[PDB]
Symmetry: D2
Subunit: 256 residues, 4 copies
């Protein structure tokens, strides 16, 4: 049986490493993207070249805003992403909420305030919520006899948000929401044997903070994070749910 | 005479907090959404005890426009109301909170308003309120600033042990915890303290209470508001970015 | 008149705690290990303000047997501290596990002794003594007929707001503090039926010792987000006192950081 | 061919962990206290599968001095376990602090009992692990850089449920809290030697069934995922993963393996 994985923000960096890892384990992969169409399609071509019909791409803005066709709501856009997996491959075994907007929202010195709120909160928390709902309904709507045997949802959190980055309040809040989503979803979806966990990087693939990481005194590679993600998706991890794993080289253990 | 703004001050915990702060000498701006009668009754009681020690302000803190007026604007206006009437705002208490199911498992705009209401009241409104509050302090010349600025976020001691079916509420509380820490850090330079108070079971609607280790009952409003009040006192000036459980040990239990 | 036992009461945070409780009307049993002169000076001050409101008891809380007053065990020494409260005043309403040894136990580089004594000292003072003290305290309340019990039993464990961001080289100390946090939760749960509340207070930097260059000391305190300084003893003891008040009677099993946001920082 | 020392390896989780590591090619030093028969049986199986891939060492990890052949301290007995790995195979790449005593130490409802309970519960769950880590760390530091292994990993078996204390188990819960502290402090201090230190916290695994079937069923039925306790393998696979080179950026973290049990409330 060939399992399917949906990965948001799959075009590059961690998202792309995650998709590659899942693909190397035999997953067919639905690569979501927002703006990185060229990289997304280039990745699909690589994956489909290795193994025919093992990759597709879907575009979507996951910000908590209406888009033009009545207006399309973020929920609808999310349901469509999950539906694209069932339409093409007839299944969706794994969901990885990786897409994430990250920029300052200082408390100390309108259009910007409102789009920032919906963008940061949508991508990091609200989209993943609706995505999980859509994913869950599909599974519930599948007759028990026909369900997969290893449903796994991974939320990309942040190992460092408890030690807030000065000026990033909304981003930090959204990640805090995502942690709550992880726990609440693990509990409510446990009956459908759908596991929900979180993976929190510290510093990965930076574009003198490296030297602060206790382990290796450097940021991590994408693989050093994606391997963790892949492991949590494996049947060997089927008893793990509702937990967040830090992948930070001990950075969260430090103090100023 | 210090001023305190308390959202959702009309009844229950919000009312207890206002009364507590008032008993310590605070002038209190009582925010309310729908409980206009209860809000005005309380103001009358407080103003009767001490002239000009209470006002009331109506506002929907759901992340939606009204009349268009954005949530941020409505929030700025709440804080402005304090400076307009009394010329100051020393304490902010983000207490207002919507609480109802958002099941993941068995409706179009039903989830739309739920999203904006649950997230607005519990997280986004508090964010804008804190911004507005922080902005007024920063805009106040150092010599004229108060000496005990305190923001309290009402969190939930039990959200790490999620209530089945309440994902969006739980998510909003998680955001509020993040707001508490991020704000404490960024506002430390203005000497504005930001903390959280997390009830377990308090003043139940109407069992579940027999589950509480301590006293085997839910708490009274005072048992929570006193903690809020203490965190606002100058005896607590070194505390910031922390959340205090007031749950009688409920979070220490397991199924 | 309610009684409070405070371990390591002779100076610094322990003294401030005793003074605070004393200012609220508590009679205070001041425990000390080596600071006899400081302890007696404090008792004198408290007894001078209010006759018979203070006493002092000496005890090594390290997890080692002591010279017969058959060797005396740590548990026995702990029971005796609690007993000294009931013997003199007929009661013990509040316990504050404040005493604490603090020094390096590096993982990397007349010798065994230092290893075996460090283990028992750091662990005893910070965790094991508090355990037996709580047991003793718990036993005395349980042995009191309901009709004679106090109405506000409170136990406070002094923890560390920064142990989750370990100080390099202090593994055993950090370990003992983690054990203390465990004790706090387990005790709150088990003693809830006797209405004995058990909480923790975790300082960050308080009355930071200045055995180092002025600038190096400016550095450390400047890392605290709020006020860019370590705290005074009062800024911590007032929190302790509050947790002991009847206005905190619904709080139990919780640890309160008093760190001015220090734990929110990163390297 | 890497070496792994596993304490309390004789049965249950310890055994599953040794088997897991053995299946990955590790040579395994199986520590035991009282389960000599089960320990030797396991060694035989492993050695039969791959010659000279298993040994055993007996040791009481309680924080008490043992009788020789001058009393032996816990630290010495700990160094000797680590030494046994370097003596036999010339290396120790992985350490798994699995050994653990677990029994009640009530505060109420009421000897050499309390002196031994304290030392046994605290020794096995915390103090031994401390000294073992020290010993393990010294051996690595005393190895010239050019000869060091490339994947040093220490895993501490913690408890996903200690923050929701089991009534009457104060000392155990305290020792587990100390073990968590040990995990973080050690990760930090040993980072420079590239020695990773993490924790794995089971919830309910291979739940002891010494009670009415209904009572046993009620207990496991509380676990949200599968409504059952876990198998040993469902825990050991996590341990094994954390030891793999794919996990070489993870350190100072504790991973719950509890099927969501810690998410529940009374
Ligand atoms: N890298 C690090 O040091 C850390 C990473 N993390 C988390 O790990 C995950 C991946 O990290 P990283 O690779 O750095 O991520 P990136 O910052 O590179 O962003 C990943 C993708 O998110 C997509 N995205 C952003 N906003 C939206 C939106 N509004 N709608 C739809 N898609 C959007 C972008 O896709 P596109 O280009 O197609 O528009 C982008 O490629 C993230 O969730 C991040 O929060 C956490 C802590 C540290
Ligand atoms: N009580 C408990 O057991 C627990 C309480 N808490 C938290 O403590 C705080 C107070 O608790 P409690 O007294 O029970 O709170 P309530 O549930 O009684 O709600 C408080 C007030 O919030 C206001 N409110 C709700 N939605 C909105 C909105 N969209 N815009 C503006 N105001 C709104 C309401 O004001 P109005 O009536 O005027 O419309 C209401 O009176 C809350 O933050 C809650 O989350 C956390 C855990 C447990
Ligand atoms: N001050 C700070 O920055 C921080 C403090 N804390 C905690 O707060 C509490 C008080 O802090 P602080 O005032 O600095 O504490 P101190 O370091 O000054 O120690 C307090 C007392 O503990 C006693 N003590 C130490 N070892 C033993 C022992 N083996 N047996 C009996 N008594 C012993 C000493 O009593 P004597 O002198 O009589 O021998 C000492 O006066 C402690 O628990 C500490 O761990 C936590 C984080 C930070
Ligand atoms: N199983 C579960 O549901 C849970 C397990 N855990 C943790 O997982 C780990 C393994 O679990 P599990 O397999 O159940 O463990 P066990 O309860 O079976 O104990 C493991 C081994 O520890 C050894 N041991 C106990 N005390 C000592 C001592 N004083 N000195 C030396 N060795 C000692 C015993 O070895 P011997 O037989 O040779 O004497 C025993 O076989 C433990 O650390 C445990 O705390 C945590 C939560 C739940």
């Amino acid at each position: 049986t060939v399992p399917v994985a949906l990965v948001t923000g799959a075009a590059k960096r961690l998202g792309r490493s995650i998709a590659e890892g899942l693909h190397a384990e035999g997953y067919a992969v639905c690569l979501h993207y927002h703006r990185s169409a060229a990289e997304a399609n280039a990745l699909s071509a690589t994956l489909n070249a290795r193994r025919p019909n093992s990759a597709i791409t879907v575009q979507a803005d996951l910000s908590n805003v209406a888009t033009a066709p009545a207006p399309v709501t973020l929920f609808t856009r999310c349901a469509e992403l999950v539906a694209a997996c069932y339409t093409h491959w007839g299944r969706c075994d794994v969901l990885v909420n990786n897409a994430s907007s990250f920029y300052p929202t200082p408390l100390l010195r309108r259009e910007a305030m409102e789009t920032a709120t919906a963008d940061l909160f949508g991508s990091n928390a609200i989209a993943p919520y609706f995505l999980i709902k859509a994913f869950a309904h599909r599974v519930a709507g599948t007759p028990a006899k026909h369900r997969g045997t290893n449903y796994s949802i991974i939320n990309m959190v942040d190992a460092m948000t408890n030690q807030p980055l000065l000026g990033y309040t909304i981003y930090t809040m959204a990640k805090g929401a995502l942690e709550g989503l992880t726990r609440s979803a693990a509990l409510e979806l446990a009956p459908l044997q759908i596991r929900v966990n979180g993976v929190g990087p510290g510093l990965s693939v930076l574009v003198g903070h490296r030297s602060k990481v206790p382990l290796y005194q450097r940021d991590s590679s994408a693989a050093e994070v994606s391997d963790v993600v892949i492991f949590l998706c494996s049947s060997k991890a089927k008893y793990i749910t509702g937990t967040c794993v830090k992948v930070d080289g001990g950075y969260s253990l430090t103090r100023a």
